Amino acid sequence: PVNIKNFNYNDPINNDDIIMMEPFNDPGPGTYYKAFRIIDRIWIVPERFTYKDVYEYYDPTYLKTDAEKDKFLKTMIKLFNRINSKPSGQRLLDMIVDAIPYLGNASTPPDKFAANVANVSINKKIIQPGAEDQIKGLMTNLIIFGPGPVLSDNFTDSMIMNGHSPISEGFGARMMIRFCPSCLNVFNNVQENKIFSRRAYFADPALTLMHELIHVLHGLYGIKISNLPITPFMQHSDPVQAEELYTFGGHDPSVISPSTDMNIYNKALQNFQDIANRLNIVSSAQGSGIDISLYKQIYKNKYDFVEDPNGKYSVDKDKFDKLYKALMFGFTETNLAGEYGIKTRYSYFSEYLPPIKTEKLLDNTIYTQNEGFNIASKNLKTEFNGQNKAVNKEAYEEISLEHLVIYRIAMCKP
Amino acid sequence: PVNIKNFNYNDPINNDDIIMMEPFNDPGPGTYYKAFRIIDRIWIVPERFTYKDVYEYYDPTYLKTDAEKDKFLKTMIKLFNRINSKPSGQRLLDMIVDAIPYLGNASTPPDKFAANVANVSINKKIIQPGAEDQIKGLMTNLIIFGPGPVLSDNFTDSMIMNGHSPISEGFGARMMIRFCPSCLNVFNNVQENKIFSRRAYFADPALTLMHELIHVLHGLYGIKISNLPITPFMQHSDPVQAEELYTFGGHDPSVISPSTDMNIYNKALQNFQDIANRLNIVSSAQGSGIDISLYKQIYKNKYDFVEDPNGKYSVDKDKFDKLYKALMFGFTETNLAGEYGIKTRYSYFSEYLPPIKTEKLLDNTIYTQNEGFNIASKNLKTEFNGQNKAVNKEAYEEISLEHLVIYRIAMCKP
Ligand SMILES: [Zn+2]
Ligand SMILES: [Zn+2]
């Protein structure tokens, strides 16, 4: 299991695991932020991200003081510690750490490694007293920010290139998440009065995190692949994306057809073969310092390629099949919920109610690494009572209308 | 199997199976229409109903001439003949004919039958030459209109009462459909090039009809029951209604929870028990002509009640279970599609593409009772090629932008 490092927000810059970084590529002089490497290749940036019915949670004041940055940082670490408490989440974190993006993309020459590209590298600033600060490239797998203007809208992405998309073509891409750990999704369950009624529950934010991490993993493997578009009417994407459904509950035959399964399977396979074909012709790097054979070995390990006695890489069908299934159907939100004794929504189509806030995720009488909210010593384990809005009221507070912007779905002229 | 009668639009009023009827209850003097009883308790009224992305089909000119009324009428009959060609659709039609609404509703005294209520009776006008025309009550199960302003929007309903809703409380209610037989839904299938691509298909309008008929049946049994509302935010209905999903494909465990299944089961059972309790105390009718024991027998047969040696009705659990399952899980769009060799959408969540028009449903070289579009002698049976937009082009025509209003889904202030 991966090591997870503790930090205080005010711990000094050391240019190693506490740094100034510029993660959005450059207007030349861009904005640098204080970042914390809690796990290899995984950084927390405790700052706001600035670069039927629906509830947007606003809070302009979230993450403005150093005290609150520190709380965000500590909460993120606690959540990773939680994920790290059980073998499945441990495996999730090991696989992310290992899933280094390919040194290149569709526009890099196939016979080269190129680290100096936006899907691979950000700017890091080496802070030295007495001399001018140097700007150095830095490779990462995952950067976690705080939220943009809307807190209730956790979201994972890349910066995608001119034309092509590395996260869907096997190259993969360094991943960024916007996250609010203290903002809890709320859902329903129709439940038998130990008469039937709707019982309201709130998310365990570690499972919320694990969900985005699944996406991260798919993106890093370059297999975040879209369903065919719906193209003639005006071209547009399928409302029901198979990778989204996979991330929630693996196969979903009643919603995703076996043909759609197969199409995505075949495109992931072709993506891996493309990477193997590239590896067989890479003979140098665009810049200096890149040791080719070392990175060939890393990618062989990441994509689980076979290597013949001449050094040629190929995709083995059994090895691909086992790795694909792990990535698409092994790590799902509902598998992990079950492993962790966490209640989640019944289905991908269940609606969210208005979100709620907790200030108590660092309080071990309320939320623990090993049990989350569902603490057996308080009788909150049974029926996931610790996530039950009617039972575990001390865990959370409702969000006022001063924070909450409400919309209704309408049909309008395009 | 039910008899289905042939008619011409211009066949004269005979006050029996060709009548003037006023199906929306009264501004006093309301509007009367020429209606055709093709099956017992089932009437065709060939007139317009006046009382991600989205495509509304307008055609103000549809159903204005007598020639086109006649075509609508003949097409409706052909579609019922199609449904009537196989044992499952035969059973569907027999069950509708037999599922007379209860003579009353929540506001009628439990100890009476009341035929003169809006869920039961419409006005019929007896046309006699020489004398003033008499207005008489008329009980029906199903009235099929032409479309309202939007053709692309087939829809089934009642006129629901002040307060209560008979279609969800066991009483049931006479049902009305707005239907456009010649307006075809279009859907996709991701398909293996006998490379993967999206193949466009069009609906068989008989399966489209069968779908609404399922709803009709549920409504007539008083078991068109809503999921619990989502109530505190502002109260509203569940986007994913279990009866809608049942109508499409029966159980759907990945979407509908076993608790939601059970809640709806229990409420249907209670609805039947309420009807049985009423039957045990009905001793007269509000008006004249209603023979109580005859209608008690009809309802015993409809709801499959047991009768004890004292004349008391009760609900038998095995009999309810078998009837419930038939109504909710036996008659589904996907069961019937399979029985009829009709292609439909892969799931309830699949999106519709812009609709298309056929003028050829009365042409037996293109659409038949026994095979629909999928005619083996033209090699249109294999892979449902007769519903394939790319293969069976002669079957249909695309709808112009002069007819087609386009909307996009937006999030707006409520
Ligand atoms: Zn997701
Ligand atoms: Zn329906």
Coordinates of N, CA, C and O in Angstrom, one line a residue, chain B residues 128-281:
Chain B
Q128 N -82.3 11.4 -34.8 CA -83.5 10.9 -35.4 C -84.1 12.0 -36.3 O -84.2 13.2 -35.9
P129 N -84.3 11.7 -37.6 CA -85.0 12.6 -38.5 C -86.5 12.9 -38.2 O -87.3 11.9 -38.0
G130 N -86.8 14.2 -38.0 CA -88.2 14.5 -37.7 C -88.3 15.1 -36.2 O -89.1 16.0 -36.0
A131 N -87.5 14.5 -35.3 CA -87.6 15.0 -33.9 C -86.3 15.5 -33.4 O -85.3 15.3 -34.0
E132 N -86.4 16.3 -32.3 CA -85.2 16.8 -31.6 C -84.4 15.6 -31.1 O -84.8 14.6 -30.6
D133 N -83.1 15.9 -31.2 CA -82.1 14.8 -30.9 C -81.8 14.7 -29.4 O -81.6 15.7 -28.7
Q134 N -81.9 13.4 -28.9 CA -81.8 13.2 -27.5 C -80.3 12.9 -27.1 O -79.6 12.4 -27.9
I135 N -80.0 13.3 -25.9 CA -78.7 13.2 -25.3 C -78.7 12.1 -24.2 O -79.4 12.2 -23.3
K136 N -78.0 11.0 -24.4 CA -78.0 9.8 -23.6 C -76.5 9.5 -23.1 O -75.6 9.9 -23.8
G137 N -76.4 9.0 -21.9 CA -75.1 8.6 -21.4 C -74.6 7.4 -22.1 O -75.3 6.7 -22.7
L138 N -73.2 7.3 -22.2 CA -72.6 6.2 -22.9 C -71.3 5.8 -22.2 O -70.5 6.7 -22.1
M139 N -71.2 4.6 -21.9 CA -70.1 4.0 -21.2 C -69.1 3.5 -22.2 O -69.5 2.7 -23.1
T140 N -67.8 3.8 -22.1 CA -66.8 3.3 -23.0 C -65.6 2.9 -22.2 O -65.4 3.5 -21.1
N141 N -64.6 2.2 -22.8 CA -63.3 1.9 -22.1 C -62.2 2.8 -22.7 O -61.3 3.2 -22.0
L142 N -62.2 2.9 -24.0 CA -61.2 3.6 -24.8 C -61.8 4.4 -26.0 O -62.6 3.8 -26.8
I143 N -61.4 5.7 -26.0 CA -61.6 6.6 -27.1 C -60.2 7.0 -27.7 O -59.4 7.5 -27.0
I144 N -60.0 6.7 -29.0 CA -58.8 7.2 -29.8 C -59.1 8.3 -30.7 O -59.9 8.2 -31.7
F145 N -58.6 9.5 -30.3 CA -58.5 10.6 -31.2 C -57.3 10.7 -32.1 O -56.3 10.0 -31.8
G146 N -57.3 11.6 -33.0 CA -56.2 12.1 -33.7 C -55.4 13.0 -32.8 O -55.8 13.3 -31.6
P147 N -54.3 13.5 -33.3 CA -53.4 14.3 -32.4 C -53.9 15.7 -32.1 O -54.8 16.2 -32.8
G148 N -53.3 16.4 -31.1 CA -53.6 17.8 -30.8 C -52.6 18.6 -31.8 O -52.3 18.1 -32.8
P149 N -52.3 19.8 -31.5 CA -51.3 20.5 -32.4 C -49.9 19.9 -32.7 O -49.4 20.1 -33.9
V150 N -49.4 19.1 -31.8 CA -48.1 18.4 -32.0 C -48.4 17.0 -32.4 O -49.0 16.3 -31.6
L151 N -48.1 16.6 -33.6 CA -48.4 15.2 -34.0 C -47.5 14.2 -33.4 O -47.9 13.1 -33.1
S152 N -46.2 14.5 -33.2 CA -45.2 13.6 -32.7 C -45.4 13.2 -31.3 O -44.5 12.6 -30.7
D153 N -46.5 13.6 -30.6 CA -46.6 13.5 -29.2 C -47.9 12.7 -28.9 O -48.8 13.1 -28.2
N154 N -48.0 11.4 -29.4 CA -48.9 10.3 -28.8 C -48.9 10.4 -27.3 O -47.9 10.5 -26.7
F155 N -50.1 10.3 -26.8 CA -50.3 10.5 -25.4 C -51.6 9.9 -24.8 O -52.7 10.1 -25.4
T156 N -51.6 9.2 -23.7 CA -52.8 8.7 -23.1 C -53.1 9.3 -21.7 O -52.2 9.3 -20.9
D157 N -54.3 9.5 -21.5 CA -54.8 10.2 -20.3 C -56.3 9.9 -19.9 O -56.9 9.0 -20.5
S158 N -56.7 10.5 -18.8 CA -58.2 10.7 -18.5 C -58.5 12.2 -18.4 O -57.7 13.0 -18.6
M159 N -59.8 12.4 -18.0 CA -60.2 13.7 -17.4 C -60.2 13.3 -15.9 O -61.1 12.5 -15.5
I160 N -59.2 13.9 -15.1 CA -59.2 13.5 -13.7 C -60.0 14.6 -12.8 O -60.1 15.8 -13.1
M161 N -60.5 14.0 -11.7 CA -61.6 14.6 -10.9 C -61.1 15.7 -10.0 O -59.9 16.0 -10.1
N162 N -62.0 16.3 -9.3 CA -61.7 17.3 -8.3 C -61.2 16.6 -7.0 O -62.0 15.9 -6.3
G163 N -59.9 16.7 -6.8 CA -59.2 15.9 -5.8 C -58.7 14.6 -6.4 O -57.9 14.6 -7.3
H164 N -59.3 13.5 -6.0 CA -58.9 12.2 -6.3 C -58.6 11.8 -7.8 O -58.9 12.5 -8.8
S165 N -58.0 10.6 -8.0 CA -57.6 10.1 -9.3 C -57.9 8.6 -9.5 O -57.2 7.7 -9.1
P166 N -59.1 8.3 -10.1 CA -59.6 6.9 -10.3 C -58.7 5.9 -10.9 O -58.8 4.7 -10.6
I167 N -57.8 6.4 -11.8 CA -56.9 5.5 -12.5 C -55.7 5.0 -11.7 O -55.1 4.1 -12.1
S168 N -55.6 5.5 -10.5 CA -54.6 5.1 -9.5 C -55.2 4.6 -8.2 O -54.5 4.3 -7.3
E169 N -56.5 4.4 -8.1 CA -57.2 4.0 -6.9 C -58.2 2.8 -7.1 O -59.1 2.7 -6.3
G170 N -57.9 2.0 -8.1 CA -58.7 0.7 -8.4 C -60.0 0.9 -9.1 O -60.4 0.0 -9.8
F171 N -60.6 2.1 -9.0 CA -61.9 2.4 -9.8 C -61.6 2.2 -11.3 O -62.4 1.6 -12.0
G172 N -60.5 2.7 -11.7 CA -60.1 2.9 -13.1 C -61.0 4.0 -13.7 O -61.8 4.6 -13.0
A173 N -60.9 4.2 -15.0 CA -61.5 5.3 -15.7 C -61.4 5.1 -17.1 O -60.6 4.4 -17.6
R174 N -62.5 5.6 -17.8 CA -62.5 5.5 -19.2 C -61.2 6.3 -19.7 O -60.8 7.3 -19.2
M175 N -60.6 5.7 -20.7 CA -59.2 6.2 -21.2 C -59.4 6.9 -22.6 O -60.2 6.5 -23.4
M176 N -58.6 7.9 -22.8 CA -58.4 8.6 -24.1 C -57.0 8.6 -24.5 O -56.1 8.9 -23.8
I177 N -56.8 8.2 -25.8 CA -55.5 8.3 -26.5 C -55.6 9.4 -27.6 O -56.6 9.5 -28.3
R178 N -54.6 10.2 -27.7 CA -54.2 11.0 -29.0 C -53.2 10.2 -29.7 O -52.1 10.0 -29.2
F179 N -53.4 9.9 -31.0 CA -52.6 9.1 -31.8 C -52.4 9.6 -33.2 O -53.4 10.0 -33.9
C180 N -51.2 9.5 -33.7 CA -50.8 9.7 -35.1 C -50.2 8.5 -35.7 O -49.0 8.2 -35.5
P181 N -50.9 7.7 -36.4 CA -50.3 6.4 -36.9 C -49.2 6.5 -37.9 O -48.3 5.6 -38.0
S182 N -49.3 7.6 -38.7 CA -48.4 7.8 -39.8 C -47.1 8.6 -39.4 O -46.2 8.8 -40.2
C183 N -47.1 9.0 -38.2 CA -45.9 9.7 -37.6 C -45.0 8.7 -36.9 O -45.4 8.2 -35.9
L184 N -43.8 8.4 -37.4 CA -43.0 7.3 -36.9 C -41.9 7.8 -36.0 O -41.1 8.7 -36.5
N185 N -41.8 7.2 -34.8 CA -40.6 7.5 -34.0 C -39.4 6.9 -34.7 O -39.5 5.8 -35.3
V186 N -38.2 7.5 -34.5 CA -36.9 7.1 -35.0 C -35.9 6.9 -33.8 O -35.8 7.7 -33.0
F187 N -35.2 5.8 -33.8 CA -34.2 5.5 -32.8 C -32.9 4.9 -33.4 O -32.9 4.7 -34.6
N188 N -31.9 4.7 -32.6 CA -30.6 4.2 -33.0 C -30.2 2.8 -32.5 O -30.7 2.4 -31.5
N189 N -29.3 2.1 -33.2 CA -28.6 0.9 -32.7 C -27.2 1.1 -33.2 O -27.0 1.4 -34.3
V190 N -26.3 0.9 -32.2 CA -24.9 0.7 -32.6 C -24.8 -0.7 -33.1 O -25.1 -1.7 -32.4
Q191 N -24.3 -0.8 -34.3 CA -24.2 -2.1 -35.0 C -22.9 -2.4 -35.7 O -22.2 -1.5 -36.3
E192 N -22.6 -3.7 -35.6 CA -21.4 -4.3 -36.2 C -21.5 -4.5 -37.7 O -22.5 -5.1 -38.1
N193 N -20.7 -3.8 -38.5 CA -20.7 -3.8 -40.0 C -20.8 -5.2 -40.6 O -19.8 -5.8 -41.1
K194 N -22.0 -5.8 -40.4 CA -22.2 -7.2 -40.6 C -21.0 -8.0 -40.3 O -20.3 -7.9 -39.3
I195 N -16.0 -2.7 -38.2 CA -16.4 -1.3 -37.8 C -17.8 -1.2 -37.3 O -18.7 -1.8 -37.8
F196 N -17.9 -0.4 -36.3 CA -19.2 -0.1 -35.5 C -19.7 1.3 -36.0 O -19.0 2.2 -36.2
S197 N -21.1 1.3 -36.2 CA -21.7 2.6 -36.6 C -23.1 2.6 -36.0 O -23.7 1.6 -35.6
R198 N -23.7 3.8 -36.1 CA -25.1 4.0 -35.6 C -26.0 3.8 -36.7 O -26.0 4.4 -37.8
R199 N -26.9 2.8 -36.6 CA -27.9 2.6 -37.5 C -29.3 3.1 -37.0 O -29.7 2.8 -35.9
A200 N -30.0 3.9 -37.9 CA -31.2 4.5 -37.6 C -32.4 3.6 -38.0 O -32.5 3.0 -39.1
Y201 N -33.4 3.4 -37.1 CA -34.6 2.7 -37.4 C -35.8 3.5 -37.0 O -35.7 4.4 -36.2
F202 N -36.9 3.1 -37.6 CA -38.2 3.7 -37.4 C -39.1 2.7 -36.7 O -39.0 1.4 -37.0
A203 N -40.0 3.2 -35.9 CA -41.0 2.3 -35.2 C -42.1 1.7 -36.1 O -42.5 2.3 -37.1
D204 N -42.5 0.5 -35.8 CA -43.7 -0.1 -36.2 C -44.9 0.6 -35.4 O -45.0 0.3 -34.3
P205 N -45.8 1.3 -36.1 CA -46.8 2.0 -35.3 C -47.8 1.2 -34.6 O -48.5 1.7 -33.7
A206 N -47.9 -0.1 -34.9 CA -48.7 -1.1 -34.1 C -48.1 -1.3 -32.8 O -48.8 -1.6 -31.9
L207 N -46.7 -1.3 -32.7 CA -46.1 -1.5 -31.4 C -46.2 -0.2 -30.6 O -46.5 -0.2 -29.5
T208 N -46.1 1.0 -31.4 CA -46.4 2.2 -30.8 C -47.8 2.3 -30.1 O -48.0 2.8 -29.0
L209 N -48.8 1.8 -30.8 CA -50.2 1.7 -30.3 C -50.3 0.7 -29.2 O -50.9 1.0 -28.2
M210 N -49.7 -0.5 -29.3 CA -49.7 -1.5 -28.2 C -49.1 -0.9 -26.9 O -49.6 -1.1 -25.8
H211 N -48.1 -0.1 -27.0 CA -47.5 0.6 -25.9 C -48.6 1.5 -25.1 O -48.8 1.3 -24.0
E212 N -49.2 2.4 -25.8 CA -50.3 3.2 -25.2 C -51.4 2.3 -24.7 O -52.0 2.7 -23.7
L213 N -51.7 1.2 -25.4 CA -52.8 0.3 -24.9 C -52.4 -0.3 -23.6 O -53.4 -0.6 -22.8
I214 N -51.2 -0.6 -23.3 CA -50.7 -1.1 -22.0 C -51.0 -0.1 -20.9 O -51.5 -0.5 -19.8
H215 N -50.8 1.2 -21.1 CA -51.2 2.2 -20.3 C -52.7 2.3 -20.0 O -53.1 2.6 -18.9
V216 N -53.4 2.3 -21.1 CA -54.9 2.1 -21.1 C -55.3 1.0 -20.2 O -56.1 1.3 -19.3
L217 N -54.8 -0.2 -20.3 CA -55.1 -1.3 -19.5 C -54.8 -1.0 -18.0 O -55.6 -1.3 -17.1
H218 N -53.6 -0.5 -17.7 CA -53.3 -0.1 -16.4 C -54.3 0.9 -15.8 O -54.7 0.7 -14.7
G219 N -54.6 1.9 -16.6 CA -55.6 2.9 -16.2 C -57.0 2.4 -15.9 O -57.7 2.9 -15.0
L220 N -57.5 1.5 -16.8 CA -58.8 0.8 -16.6 C -58.9 -0.1 -15.4 O -60.0 -0.2 -14.8
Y221 N -57.7 -0.6 -15.0 CA -57.6 -1.4 -13.7 C -57.4 -0.6 -12.4 O -57.5 -1.1 -11.3
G222 N -57.2 0.7 -12.6 CA -57.0 1.6 -11.5 C -55.7 1.3 -10.8 O -55.5 1.6 -9.6
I223 N -54.7 0.9 -11.6 CA -53.3 0.6 -11.1 C -52.2 1.4 -11.8 O -51.1 1.0 -11.8
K224 N -52.6 2.6 -12.4 CA -51.6 3.5 -12.9 C -51.1 4.3 -11.8 O -51.4 5.5 -11.6
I225 N -50.2 3.7 -11.0 CA -49.8 4.2 -9.7 C -48.4 4.9 -9.8 O -47.5 4.3 -10.3
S226 N -48.3 6.1 -9.3 CA -47.1 6.8 -9.1 C -46.2 6.4 -8.0 O -46.6 5.9 -7.0
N227 N -44.9 6.4 -8.2 CA -43.9 6.4 -7.2 C -44.2 7.5 -6.2 O -44.8 8.5 -6.6
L228 N -43.9 7.2 -4.9 CA -43.9 8.3 -3.9 C -43.3 9.6 -4.5 O -42.4 9.5 -5.3
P229 N -43.9 10.8 -4.2 CA -43.3 12.0 -4.7 C -41.9 12.3 -3.9 O -41.7 11.7 -2.9
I230 N -41.2 13.2 -4.5 CA -39.9 13.6 -3.8 C -40.2 15.0 -3.0 O -40.1 16.1 -3.5
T231 N -40.7 14.8 -1.7 CA -41.4 16.0 -1.0 C -40.6 16.4 0.3 O -40.1 15.6 1.0
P232 N -40.4 17.8 0.4 CA -39.5 18.3 1.6 C -40.0 18.1 3.0 O -39.3 18.4 3.9
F233 N -36.5 22.8 -0.7 CA -37.0 22.3 -1.9 C -38.5 22.1 -2.0 O -39.3 22.1 -1.0
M234 N -39.0 22.0 -3.3 CA -40.4 22.1 -3.7 C -40.8 20.7 -4.2 O -40.1 20.1 -5.0
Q235 N -41.9 20.1 -3.6 CA -42.4 18.8 -3.9 C -42.5 18.6 -5.4 O -42.8 19.5 -6.1
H236 N -42.2 17.4 -5.9 CA -42.3 17.1 -7.3 C -42.3 15.6 -7.5 O -42.0 14.8 -6.5
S237 N -42.5 15.1 -8.7 CA -42.6 13.7 -8.9 C -41.3 13.1 -9.3 O -40.4 13.8 -9.9
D238 N -41.1 11.8 -9.0 CA -39.9 11.1 -9.4 C -39.8 11.1 -11.0 O -40.7 10.8 -11.7
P239 N -38.6 11.6 -11.5 CA -38.4 11.5 -13.0 C -38.5 10.1 -13.5 O -38.9 9.9 -14.7
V240 N -38.3 9.1 -12.7 CA -38.3 7.7 -13.1 C -39.4 7.0 -12.5 O -39.3 6.4 -11.5
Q241 N -40.5 7.0 -13.2 CA -41.8 6.4 -12.8 C -41.8 4.9 -13.1 O -41.6 4.5 -14.2
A242 N -42.0 4.0 -12.1 CA -42.0 2.6 -12.2 C -43.0 2.0 -13.2 O -42.7 1.1 -13.9
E243 N -44.2 2.5 -13.3 CA -45.2 2.1 -14.2 C -44.8 2.4 -15.7 O -45.1 1.6 -16.6
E244 N -44.0 3.5 -15.9 CA -43.5 3.8 -17.2 C -42.5 2.8 -17.6 O -42.5 2.3 -18.8
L245 N -41.6 2.4 -16.7 CA -40.6 1.4 -17.0 C -41.1 0.0 -17.1 O -40.6 -0.7 -18.0
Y246 N -42.1 -0.3 -16.3 CA -42.9 -1.6 -16.5 C -43.5 -1.7 -17.9 O -43.4 -2.7 -18.5
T247 N -44.1 -0.6 -18.3 CA -44.7 -0.6 -19.6 C -43.8 -0.9 -20.7 O -44.2 -1.6 -21.7
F248 N -42.5 -0.5 -20.6 CA -41.4 -0.7 -21.6 C -40.8 -2.1 -21.5 O -40.7 -2.7 -22.5
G249 N -40.4 -2.5 -20.3 CA -39.7 -3.8 -20.2 C -39.9 -4.6 -18.9 O -39.0 -5.3 -18.6
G250 N -41.0 -4.4 -18.3 CA -41.3 -5.1 -17.0 C -40.3 -4.7 -15.9 O -40.0 -3.5 -15.8
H251 N -39.8 -5.7 -15.2 CA -38.9 -5.4 -14.1 C -37.7 -4.7 -14.7 O -37.3 -5.0 -15.8
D252 N -37.1 -3.8 -13.9 CA -35.9 -3.2 -14.3 C -35.1 -2.9 -13.0 O -35.1 -1.7 -12.5
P253 N -34.5 -4.0 -12.4 CA -33.9 -3.9 -11.1 C -32.7 -3.0 -10.9 O -32.4 -2.6 -9.8
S254 N -32.1 -2.7 -12.1 CA -30.9 -1.8 -12.1 C -31.4 -0.4 -12.0 O -30.5 0.5 -11.7
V255 N -32.7 -0.1 -12.2 CA -33.2 1.2 -12.1 C -34.3 1.3 -11.0 O -34.3 2.3 -10.2
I256 N -35.2 0.3 -10.9 CA -36.3 0.3 -9.9 C -35.9 -0.6 -8.7 O -35.6 -1.8 -8.9
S257 N -35.8 -0.1 -7.6 CA -35.6 -0.9 -6.4 C -36.8 -1.9 -6.0 O -37.9 -1.6 -6.3
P258 N -36.4 -3.0 -5.4 CA -37.4 -4.0 -4.9 C -38.4 -3.4 -3.9 O -39.5 -3.8 -3.8
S259 N -38.0 -2.4 -3.1 CA -38.9 -1.6 -2.3 C -39.9 -0.8 -3.1 O -41.1 -0.7 -2.6
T260 N -39.5 -0.1 -4.1 CA -40.4 0.6 -5.0 C -41.3 -0.4 -5.7 O -42.5 -0.2 -5.7
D261 N -40.8 -1.6 -6.2 CA -41.7 -2.6 -6.7 C -42.8 -3.0 -5.7 O -44.0 -3.0 -6.1
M262 N -42.4 -3.2 -4.5 CA -43.3 -3.7 -3.4 C -44.4 -2.7 -3.0 O -45.5 -3.0 -2.9
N263 N -44.0 -1.4 -2.8 CA -44.9 -0.3 -2.6 C -46.0 -0.2 -3.7 O -47.2 -0.1 -3.3
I264 N -45.6 -0.2 -4.9 CA -46.6 -0.3 -6.0 C -47.5 -1.6 -6.0 O -48.7 -1.5 -6.2
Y265 N -46.9 -2.7 -5.8 CA -47.6 -4.0 -5.5 C -48.7 -3.8 -4.4 O -49.8 -4.2 -4.6
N266 N -48.3 -3.3 -3.3 CA -49.1 -3.2 -2.1 C -50.3 -2.2 -2.3 O -51.4 -2.4 -1.8
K267 N -50.0 -1.1 -3.0 CA -51.0 -0.1 -3.3 C -52.0 -0.6 -4.4 O -53.2 -0.3 -4.3
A268 N -51.6 -1.4 -5.4 CA -52.5 -2.0 -6.3 C -53.4 -3.0 -5.5 O -54.6 -3.1 -5.7
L269 N -52.8 -3.8 -4.6 CA -53.6 -4.8 -3.8 C -54.6 -4.1 -3.0 O -55.8 -4.4 -3.1
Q270 N -54.2 -3.1 -2.2 CA -55.1 -2.2 -1.5 C -56.2 -1.6 -2.3 O -57.4 -1.6 -2.0
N271 N -55.9 -1.1 -3.5 CA -56.9 -0.7 -4.5 C -57.9 -1.8 -4.8 O -59.1 -1.5 -4.8
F272 N -57.5 -3.0 -5.1 CA -58.4 -4.1 -5.4 C -59.3 -4.4 -4.1 O -60.5 -4.5 -4.3
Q273 N -58.7 -4.4 -2.9 CA -59.4 -4.6 -1.7 C -60.5 -3.5 -1.5 O -61.6 -3.8 -1.1
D274 N -60.1 -2.3 -1.8 CA -61.1 -1.2 -1.7 C -62.3 -1.4 -2.6 O -63.5 -1.1 -2.2
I275 N -62.1 -1.9 -3.8 CA -63.2 -2.2 -4.7 C -64.0 -3.4 -4.2 O -65.2 -3.3 -4.2
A276 N -63.3 -4.4 -3.8 CA -64.1 -5.6 -3.1 C -64.9 -5.1 -1.9 O -66.1 -5.4 -1.9
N277 N -64.3 -4.3 -1.0 CA -65.1 -3.7 0.1 C -66.4 -2.9 -0.4 O -67.4 -3.1 0.2
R278 N -66.2 -2.0 -1.4 CA -67.3 -1.3 -2.0 C -68.4 -2.3 -2.6 O -69.6 -2.0 -2.3
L279 N -68.0 -3.4 -3.2 CA -68.9 -4.3 -3.8 C -69.8 -4.9 -2.8 O -70.9 -5.2 -3.0
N280 N -69.2 -5.1 -1.6 CA -69.9 -5.8 -0.5 C -71.0 -4.9 0.1 O -71.7 -5.3 0.9
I281 N -71.0 -3.6 -0.2 CA -72.0 -2.7 0.4 C -72.8 -2.0 -0.6 O -73.7 -1.3 -0.2

